[PDB]
Each structure stands twice: as structure tokens, then as C-alpha cells.
Coordinates of C-alpha atoms and ligand atoms in Angstrom, one line a residue:
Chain G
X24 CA 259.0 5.1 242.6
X25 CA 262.2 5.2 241.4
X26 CA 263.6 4.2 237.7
X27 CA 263.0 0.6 237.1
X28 CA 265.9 -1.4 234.9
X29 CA 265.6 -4.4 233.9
X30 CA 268.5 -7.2 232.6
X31 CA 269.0 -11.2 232.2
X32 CA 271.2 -12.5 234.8
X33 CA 274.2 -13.6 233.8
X34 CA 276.9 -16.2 235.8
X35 CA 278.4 -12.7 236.6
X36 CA 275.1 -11.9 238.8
X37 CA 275.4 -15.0 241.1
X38 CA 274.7 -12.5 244.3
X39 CA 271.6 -10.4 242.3
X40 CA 270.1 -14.5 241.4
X41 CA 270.2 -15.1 244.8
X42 CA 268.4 -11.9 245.5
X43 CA 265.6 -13.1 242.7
X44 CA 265.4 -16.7 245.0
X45 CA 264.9 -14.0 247.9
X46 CA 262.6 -12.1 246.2
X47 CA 260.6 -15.4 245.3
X48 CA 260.6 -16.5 248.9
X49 CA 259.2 -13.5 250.9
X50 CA 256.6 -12.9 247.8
X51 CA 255.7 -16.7 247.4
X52 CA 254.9 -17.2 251.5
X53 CA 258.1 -19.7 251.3
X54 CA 261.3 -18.6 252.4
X55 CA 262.5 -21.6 254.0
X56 CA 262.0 -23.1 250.3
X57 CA 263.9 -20.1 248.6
X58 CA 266.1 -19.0 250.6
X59 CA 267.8 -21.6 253.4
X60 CA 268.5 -24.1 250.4
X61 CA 269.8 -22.2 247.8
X62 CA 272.2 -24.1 245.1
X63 CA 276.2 -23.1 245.8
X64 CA 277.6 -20.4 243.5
X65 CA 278.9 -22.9 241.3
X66 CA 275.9 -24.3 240.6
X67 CA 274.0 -20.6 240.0
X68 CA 276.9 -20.1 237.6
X69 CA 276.9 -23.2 235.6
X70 CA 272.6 -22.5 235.6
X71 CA 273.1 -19.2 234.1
X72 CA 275.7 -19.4 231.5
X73 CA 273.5 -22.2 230.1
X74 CA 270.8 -21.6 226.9
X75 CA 268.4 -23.1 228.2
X76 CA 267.7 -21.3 231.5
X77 CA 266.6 -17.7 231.7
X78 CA 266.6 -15.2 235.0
X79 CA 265.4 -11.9 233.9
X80 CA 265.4 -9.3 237.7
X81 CA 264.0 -5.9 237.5
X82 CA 265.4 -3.3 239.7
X83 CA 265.2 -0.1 241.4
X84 CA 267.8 1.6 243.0
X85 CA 269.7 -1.2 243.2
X86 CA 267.5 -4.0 244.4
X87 CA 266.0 -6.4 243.0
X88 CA 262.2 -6.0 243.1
X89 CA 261.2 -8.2 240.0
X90 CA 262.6 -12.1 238.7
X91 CA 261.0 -14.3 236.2
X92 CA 262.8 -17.3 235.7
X93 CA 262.5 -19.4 232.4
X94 CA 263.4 -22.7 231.2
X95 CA 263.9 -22.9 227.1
X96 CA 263.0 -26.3 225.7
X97 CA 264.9 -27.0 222.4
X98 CA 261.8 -29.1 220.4
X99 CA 262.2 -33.0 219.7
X100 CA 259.7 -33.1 216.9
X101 CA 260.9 -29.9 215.0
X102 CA 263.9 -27.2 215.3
X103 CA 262.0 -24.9 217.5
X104 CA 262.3 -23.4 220.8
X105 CA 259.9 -22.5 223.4
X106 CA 260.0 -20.5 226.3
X107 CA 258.1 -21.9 230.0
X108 CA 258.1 -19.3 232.8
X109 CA 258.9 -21.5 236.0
X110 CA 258.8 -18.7 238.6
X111 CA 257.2 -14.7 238.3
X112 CA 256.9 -12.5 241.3
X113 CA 256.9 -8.5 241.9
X114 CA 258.1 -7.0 245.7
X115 CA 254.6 -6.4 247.3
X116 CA 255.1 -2.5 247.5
X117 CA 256.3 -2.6 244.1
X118 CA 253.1 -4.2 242.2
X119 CA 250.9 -2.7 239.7
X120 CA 253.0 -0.4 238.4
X121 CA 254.0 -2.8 235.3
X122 CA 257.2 -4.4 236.4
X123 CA 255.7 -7.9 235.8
X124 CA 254.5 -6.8 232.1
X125 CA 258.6 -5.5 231.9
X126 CA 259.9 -8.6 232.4
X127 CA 257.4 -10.6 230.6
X128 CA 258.0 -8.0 227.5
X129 CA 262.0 -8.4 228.0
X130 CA 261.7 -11.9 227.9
X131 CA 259.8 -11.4 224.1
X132 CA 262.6 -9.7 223.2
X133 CA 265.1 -12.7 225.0
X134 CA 262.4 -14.8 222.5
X135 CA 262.8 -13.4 219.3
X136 CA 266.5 -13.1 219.5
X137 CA 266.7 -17.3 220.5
X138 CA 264.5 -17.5 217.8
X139 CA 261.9 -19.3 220.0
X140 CA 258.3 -18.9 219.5
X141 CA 256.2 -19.1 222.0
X142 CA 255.9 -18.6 225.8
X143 CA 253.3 -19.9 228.0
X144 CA 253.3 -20.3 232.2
X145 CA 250.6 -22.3 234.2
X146 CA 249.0 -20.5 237.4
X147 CA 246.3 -21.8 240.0
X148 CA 243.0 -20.9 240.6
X149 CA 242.6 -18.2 243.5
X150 CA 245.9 -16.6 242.1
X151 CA 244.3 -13.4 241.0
X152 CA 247.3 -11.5 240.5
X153 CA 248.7 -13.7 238.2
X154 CA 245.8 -15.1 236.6
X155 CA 245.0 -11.4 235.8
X156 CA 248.5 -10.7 234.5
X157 CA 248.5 -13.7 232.0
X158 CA 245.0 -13.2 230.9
X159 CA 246.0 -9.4 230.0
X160 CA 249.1 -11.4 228.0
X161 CA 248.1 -14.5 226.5
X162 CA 245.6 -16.9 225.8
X163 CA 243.9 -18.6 228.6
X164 CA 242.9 -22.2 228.5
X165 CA 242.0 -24.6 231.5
X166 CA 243.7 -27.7 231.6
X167 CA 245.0 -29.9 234.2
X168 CA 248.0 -30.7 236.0
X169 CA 249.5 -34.4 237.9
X170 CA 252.2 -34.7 240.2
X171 CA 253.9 -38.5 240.4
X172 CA 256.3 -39.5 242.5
X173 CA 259.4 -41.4 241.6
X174 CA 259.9 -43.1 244.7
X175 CA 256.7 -45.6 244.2
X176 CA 258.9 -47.0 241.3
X177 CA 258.2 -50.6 240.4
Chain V
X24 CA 250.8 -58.9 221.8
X25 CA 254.7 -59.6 221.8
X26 CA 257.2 -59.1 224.1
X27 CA 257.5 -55.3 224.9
X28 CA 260.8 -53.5 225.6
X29 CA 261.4 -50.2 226.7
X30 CA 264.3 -48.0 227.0
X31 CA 265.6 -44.8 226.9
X32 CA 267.3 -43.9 223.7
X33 CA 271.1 -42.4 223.3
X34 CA 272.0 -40.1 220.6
X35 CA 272.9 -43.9 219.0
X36 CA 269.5 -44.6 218.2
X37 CA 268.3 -41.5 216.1
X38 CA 266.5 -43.6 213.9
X39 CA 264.1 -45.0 217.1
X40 CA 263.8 -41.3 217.9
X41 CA 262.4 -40.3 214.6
X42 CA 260.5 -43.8 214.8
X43 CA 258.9 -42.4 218.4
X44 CA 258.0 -38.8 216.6
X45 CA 256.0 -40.2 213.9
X46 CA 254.1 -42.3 216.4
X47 CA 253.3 -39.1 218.0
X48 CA 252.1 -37.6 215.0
X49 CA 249.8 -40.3 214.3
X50 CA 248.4 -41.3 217.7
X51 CA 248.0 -37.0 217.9
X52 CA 246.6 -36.9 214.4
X53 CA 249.0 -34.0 213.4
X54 CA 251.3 -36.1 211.1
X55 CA 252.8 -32.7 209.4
X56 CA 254.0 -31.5 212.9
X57 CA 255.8 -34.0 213.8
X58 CA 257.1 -36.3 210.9
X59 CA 257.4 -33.4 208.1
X60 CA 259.9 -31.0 210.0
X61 CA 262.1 -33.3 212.0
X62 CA 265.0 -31.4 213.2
X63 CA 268.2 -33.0 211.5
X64 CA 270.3 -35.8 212.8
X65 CA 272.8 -33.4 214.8
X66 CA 270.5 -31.9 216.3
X67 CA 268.6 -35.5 217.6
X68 CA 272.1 -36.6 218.4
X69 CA 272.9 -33.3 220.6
X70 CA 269.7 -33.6 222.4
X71 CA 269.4 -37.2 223.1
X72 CA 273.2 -36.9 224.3
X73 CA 271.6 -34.3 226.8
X74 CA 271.6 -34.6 230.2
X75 CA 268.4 -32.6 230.6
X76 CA 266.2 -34.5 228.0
X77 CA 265.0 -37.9 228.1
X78 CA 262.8 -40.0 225.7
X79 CA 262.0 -43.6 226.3
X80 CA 260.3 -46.1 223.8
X81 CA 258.6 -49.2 223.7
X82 CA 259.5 -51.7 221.2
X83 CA 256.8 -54.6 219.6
X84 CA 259.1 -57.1 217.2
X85 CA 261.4 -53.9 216.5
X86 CA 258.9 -51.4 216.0
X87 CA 257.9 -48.4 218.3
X88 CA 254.8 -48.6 219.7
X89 CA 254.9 -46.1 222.8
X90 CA 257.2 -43.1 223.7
X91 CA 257.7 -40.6 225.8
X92 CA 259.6 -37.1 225.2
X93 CA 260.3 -35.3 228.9
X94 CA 262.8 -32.6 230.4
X95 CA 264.6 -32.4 233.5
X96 CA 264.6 -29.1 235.1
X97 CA 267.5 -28.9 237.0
X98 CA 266.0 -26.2 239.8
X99 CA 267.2 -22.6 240.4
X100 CA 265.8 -22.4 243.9
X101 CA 267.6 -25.5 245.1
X102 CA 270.5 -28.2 244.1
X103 CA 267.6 -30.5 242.9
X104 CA 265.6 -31.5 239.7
X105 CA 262.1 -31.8 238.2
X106 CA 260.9 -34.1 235.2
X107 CA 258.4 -32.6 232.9
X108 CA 256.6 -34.8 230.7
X109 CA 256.0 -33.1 226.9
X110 CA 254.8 -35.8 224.8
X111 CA 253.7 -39.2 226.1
X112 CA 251.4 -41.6 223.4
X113 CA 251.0 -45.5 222.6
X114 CA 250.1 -47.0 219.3
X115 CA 246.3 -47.2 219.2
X116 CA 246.2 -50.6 218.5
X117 CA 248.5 -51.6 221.4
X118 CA 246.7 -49.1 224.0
X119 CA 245.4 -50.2 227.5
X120 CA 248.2 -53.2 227.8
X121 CA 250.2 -51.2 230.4
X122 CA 252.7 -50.0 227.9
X123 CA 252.0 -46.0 228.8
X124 CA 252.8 -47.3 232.5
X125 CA 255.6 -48.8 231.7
X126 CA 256.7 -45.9 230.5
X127 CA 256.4 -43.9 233.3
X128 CA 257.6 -46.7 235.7
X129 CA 260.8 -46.6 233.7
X130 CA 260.9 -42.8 233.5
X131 CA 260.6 -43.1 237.5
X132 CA 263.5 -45.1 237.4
X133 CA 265.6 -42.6 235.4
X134 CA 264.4 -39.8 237.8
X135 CA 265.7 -42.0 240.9
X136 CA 268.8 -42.4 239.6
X137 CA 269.3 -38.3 238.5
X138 CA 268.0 -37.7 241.9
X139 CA 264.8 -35.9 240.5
X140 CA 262.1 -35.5 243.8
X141 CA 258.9 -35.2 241.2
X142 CA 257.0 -36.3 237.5
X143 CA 254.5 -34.3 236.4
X144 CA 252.3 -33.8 233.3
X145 CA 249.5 -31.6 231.7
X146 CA 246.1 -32.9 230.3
X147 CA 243.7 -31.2 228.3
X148 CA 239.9 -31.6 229.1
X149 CA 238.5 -34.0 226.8
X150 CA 241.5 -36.5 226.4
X151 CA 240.1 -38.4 228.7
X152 CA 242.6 -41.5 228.3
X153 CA 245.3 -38.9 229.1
X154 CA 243.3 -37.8 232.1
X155 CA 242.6 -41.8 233.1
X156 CA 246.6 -42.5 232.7
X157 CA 247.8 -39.6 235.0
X158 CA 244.4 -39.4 237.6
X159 CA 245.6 -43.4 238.3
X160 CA 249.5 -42.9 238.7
X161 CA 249.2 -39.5 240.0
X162 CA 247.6 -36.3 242.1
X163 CA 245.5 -34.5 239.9
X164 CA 245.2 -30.8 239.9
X165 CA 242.9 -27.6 237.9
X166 CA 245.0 -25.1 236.6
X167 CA 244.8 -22.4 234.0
X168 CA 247.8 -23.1 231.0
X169 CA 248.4 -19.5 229.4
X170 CA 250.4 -18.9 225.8
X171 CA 252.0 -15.6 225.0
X172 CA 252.9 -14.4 221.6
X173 CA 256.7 -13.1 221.7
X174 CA 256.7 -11.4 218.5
X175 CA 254.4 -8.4 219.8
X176 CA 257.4 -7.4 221.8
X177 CA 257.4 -3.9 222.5
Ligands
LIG201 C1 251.5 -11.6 239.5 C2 252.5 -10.5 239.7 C3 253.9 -10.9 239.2 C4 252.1 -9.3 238.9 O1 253.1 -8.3 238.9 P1 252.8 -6.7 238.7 O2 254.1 -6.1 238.5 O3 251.9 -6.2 239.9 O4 252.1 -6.8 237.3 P2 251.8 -5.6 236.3 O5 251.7 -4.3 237.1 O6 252.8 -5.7 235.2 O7 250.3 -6.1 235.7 C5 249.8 -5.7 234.4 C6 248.3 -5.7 234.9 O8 248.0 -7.1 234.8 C7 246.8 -7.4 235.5 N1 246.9 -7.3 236.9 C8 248.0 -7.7 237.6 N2 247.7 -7.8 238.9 C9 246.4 -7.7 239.1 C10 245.6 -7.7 240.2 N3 246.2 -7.9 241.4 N4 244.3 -7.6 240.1 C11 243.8 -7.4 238.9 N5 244.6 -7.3 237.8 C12 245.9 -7.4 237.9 C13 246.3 -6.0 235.3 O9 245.9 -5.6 234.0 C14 247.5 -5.2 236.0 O10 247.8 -4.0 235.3 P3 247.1 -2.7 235.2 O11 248.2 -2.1 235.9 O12 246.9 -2.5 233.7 O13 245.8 -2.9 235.8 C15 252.6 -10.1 241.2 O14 251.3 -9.9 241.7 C16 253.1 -11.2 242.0 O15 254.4 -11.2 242.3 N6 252.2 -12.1 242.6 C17 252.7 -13.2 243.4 C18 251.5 -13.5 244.4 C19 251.8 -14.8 245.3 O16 252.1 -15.8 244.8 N7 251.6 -14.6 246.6
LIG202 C1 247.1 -41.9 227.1 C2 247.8 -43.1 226.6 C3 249.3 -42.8 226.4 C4 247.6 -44.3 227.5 O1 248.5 -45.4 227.1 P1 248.0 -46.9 227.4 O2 249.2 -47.7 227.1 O3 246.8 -47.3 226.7 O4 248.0 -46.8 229.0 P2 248.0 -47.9 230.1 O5 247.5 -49.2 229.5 O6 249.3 -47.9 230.7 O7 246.9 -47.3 231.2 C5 246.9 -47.7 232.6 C6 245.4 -47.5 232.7 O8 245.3 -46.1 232.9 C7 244.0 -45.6 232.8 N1 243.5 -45.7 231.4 C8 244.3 -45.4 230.3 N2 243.5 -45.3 229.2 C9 242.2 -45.2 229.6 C10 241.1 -45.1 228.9 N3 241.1 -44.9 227.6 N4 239.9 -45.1 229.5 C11 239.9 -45.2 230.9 N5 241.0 -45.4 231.6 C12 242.2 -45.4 230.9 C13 243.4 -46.9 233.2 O9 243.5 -47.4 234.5 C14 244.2 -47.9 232.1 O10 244.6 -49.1 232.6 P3 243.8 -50.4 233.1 O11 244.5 -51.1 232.0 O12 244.2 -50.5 234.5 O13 242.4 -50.0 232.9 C15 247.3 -43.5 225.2 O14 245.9 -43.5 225.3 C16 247.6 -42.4 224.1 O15 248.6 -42.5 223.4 N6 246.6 -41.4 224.0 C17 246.8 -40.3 223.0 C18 245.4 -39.9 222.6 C19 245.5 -38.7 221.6 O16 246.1 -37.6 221.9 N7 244.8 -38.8 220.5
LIG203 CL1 269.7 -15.8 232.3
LIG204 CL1 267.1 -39.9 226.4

């Protein structure tokens, strides 16, 4: 394996975010959710100059073979920040060679220097990769999750 | 029980919002987090005059008595938007009157008309009125929450 760099996305790296959404799509089982309705360039750009989104790609030769992408919540009850990772996935051939721990460790640094101070991601059971990956990270605790839809409003 | 209002409050009604997070910190029983480090009123202001945050109250003679902090993710994958609930409580002594419904029904209405396609929430094990709310008004799913320290960055 070649040198692996890593770098937040900026609105300059429209065509490397898409490539992320790609990346997301074949290693998610989901390209028609990825990939054949991706936001226009426009939209990608206004997404990434924002604060409070974060795409962090990891790449080797060229390609992208890494993306995490973050939301950062601004706090209501205090002046704090914290970090939720939406979206994590590593190009099959390219796993378990710490490319996942890179990003997650960039996005520390993207952390400290926003001043937030925490980061913390969900994941299902029966996702052994990434329920491995967190539990070498962070803190595990078991909690529960409800979907609702807005359409059955009253 | 009075008449009950709710709405969603502009950066014009900073006062409600710091009304809404001391109600959290009592009905959480962590008054220090939430009503000894407010952030100040510029901050309130720029947040409630955000596009992607969103907290509702409900009113009793004046007073707040529910409220409800969420985000709106606006989606990288796609041109289209999630709403996360953060915070979500009602005023013990005005619990199981439908006012936590309410709440959501009127958040539903707020993600219809941002064209949001989902709600959804997290519950801990144990909070079982939490878990009552969301099991009614929603799907419920097991997952695994996981926190990860930035500041051991390497
Ligand atoms: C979860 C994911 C992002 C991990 O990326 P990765 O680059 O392979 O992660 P890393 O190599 O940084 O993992 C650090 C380690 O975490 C835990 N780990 C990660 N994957 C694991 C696995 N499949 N089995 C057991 N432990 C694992 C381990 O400690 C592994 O590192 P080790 O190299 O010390 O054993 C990657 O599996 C992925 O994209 N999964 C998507 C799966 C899907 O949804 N389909
Ligand atoms: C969770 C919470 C917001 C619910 O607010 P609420 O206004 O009492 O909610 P609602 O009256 O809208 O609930 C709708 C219903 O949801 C489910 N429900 C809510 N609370 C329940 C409870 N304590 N036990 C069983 N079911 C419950 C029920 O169906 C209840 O309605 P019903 O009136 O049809 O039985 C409130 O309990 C709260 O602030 N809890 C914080 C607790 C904490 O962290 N400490
Ligand atoms: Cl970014
Ligand atoms: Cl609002």
C-alpha cells in the first residue's frame, strides 16, 4: 500500500466530496442512495465552506479511499461544540490498515482546534467493523434509536 | 391545566429560550449544566436566527412548561434534510397531557414545511417515559451510542 494522506474537504474539493459519496455508496451496499442523487456543486460548496459540517477523505495515490463526514452542533444550553460522525467508511481492499483510526484522529485534531469537546457516532448491531473500531476509540453504551415521520402530521 | 401554546421561538424570544433551558435542567436534574453556563444573548440570538436549529416551547399562563432543542441536518449524500432531536422534556407536574406530542406534532410541521423526509431521537435504557413517548410516535431501534475523547489526539 501506497502513502496514505489525509485532508478536510474544502468547497475547493467539490469533485474529491463526490468521490467520498462514491466511496460511501459501493462500501455501504447503496449506490443508488450515494451516488445517482447527489446534491449539485453548488450545494456541495455551500455544505463545505460551512462550520458546522466536516468531510475529512483519506487518500492514496490519488483516490479517495477513506471519508468521514461530521456534523458540529453549536450547544443551546452552554457555549460548547460537539462533533457527530454521520457517515465512516474505508475502500474494502484498503481496511485494517488504520485509515479509519486516521480520520477519526484528524478529526481530534479538526476538534480541538473548533474548540469542541467531544465526538461520539451511533452504529448497529451486526456492524462488526465499526462496532470494533468505536469500541477501540470511545466509550460504548447501548441505547436506542426512533425514526418518525413528518408526513403523519396532525 | 390551562390553555397550552406552543411555538417555535425566533432569536426575538431569548428570554423563552433561557426559560426552555432551565426546564431542561430541572426536569433532567442537572440544573448547573444547563442554567449556570448559558451561552450569552448573541450567541441565543445567532442560533435561534438559524436555519439549521430549531427549538419549540410550550406555554401554561406565560410560563414554559415543555421544549424541545433539535437540528436539521441538511444531507451531504443528497439535496435533502434530517431533524435530530437533542433535548426534548415537560414540566413534571404537567407531564402525560399530550404536551411532549404536541411538540413533536408541531416539530413535524416545521419539518414539512423545510422539506425534511425524517425525525428521529435517542433514548437511554431506563428512561422509560422517554422510551413510552418515542416507542408510541415512532419505529424503535437497538443501537450502540459511542463518545470519543478528542483531546488524546495524536
Ligand atoms: C468500520 C471501518 C470504517 C473501519 O475502517 P478500517 O480502516 O478498516 O479501520 P482501522 O484499520 O482504523 O481499525 C482500527 C482497528 O479497529 C478495530 N477493527 C476495525 N475493523 C475491525 C474488524 N473488522 N474486526 C475486528 N476489529 C476491527 C480493530 O482494532 C482494527 O484495528 P487493528 O488494525 O488494531 O486490529 C470499515 O470497516 C468500513 O468502512 N466499514 C463499513 C462496513 C459496511 O457498512 N458495509
Ligand atoms: C418524556 C416526556 C417529554 C414526555 O412528555 P409528556 O408530555 O408527559 O408526553 P405525552 O403526554 O405527550 O405522552 C404521550 C404518551 O406517550 C407515552 N408516555 C409518555 N410518558 C409515559 C410514561 N411515563 N409511562 C408510560 N407511557 C408514557 C404514552 O402513550 C403517554 O401518553 P398517553 O397520555 O397516551 O398515555 C417527559 O416525561 C419528560 O420531560 N421526561 C424527562 C425525564 C427525565 O429525563 N428525568
Ligand atoms: Cl469540511
Ligand atoms: Cl427555532
Amino acid at each position: 500500500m501506497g502513502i496514505i494522506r489525509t485532508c478536510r474537504l474544502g468547497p475547493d474539493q467539490v469533485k474529491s466530496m463526490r468521490a467520498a459519496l462514491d466511496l460511501f455508496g459501493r462500501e455501504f451496499g447503496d449506490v443508488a442512495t450515494y451516488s445517482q442523487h447527489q446534491p449539485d456543486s453548488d450545494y456541495l460548496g455551500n455544505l463545505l465552506r460551512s462550520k458546522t459540517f466536516i468531510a475529512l477523505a483519506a487518500f492514496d495515490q490519488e483516490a479517495v479511499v477513506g471519508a468521514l463526514a461530521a456534523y458540529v452542533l453549536p450547544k443551546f444550553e452552554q457555549p460548547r461544540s460537539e462533533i457527530y460522525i454521520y457517515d465512516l467508511a474505508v475502500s474494502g481492499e484498503h481496511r485494517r490498515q488504520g485509515i479509519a483510526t486516521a480520520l477519526i484522529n484528524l478529526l481530534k485534531h479538526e476538534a480541538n482546534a473548533l474548540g469542541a469537546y467531544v465526538i461520539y457516532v451511533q452504529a448497529d448491531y451486526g456492524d462488526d467493523p465499526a462496532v470494533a473500531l468505536y469500541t477501540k476509540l470511545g466509550i460504548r453504551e447501548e441505547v436506542m434509536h426512533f425514526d418518525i415521520d413528518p408526513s403523519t402530521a396532525t
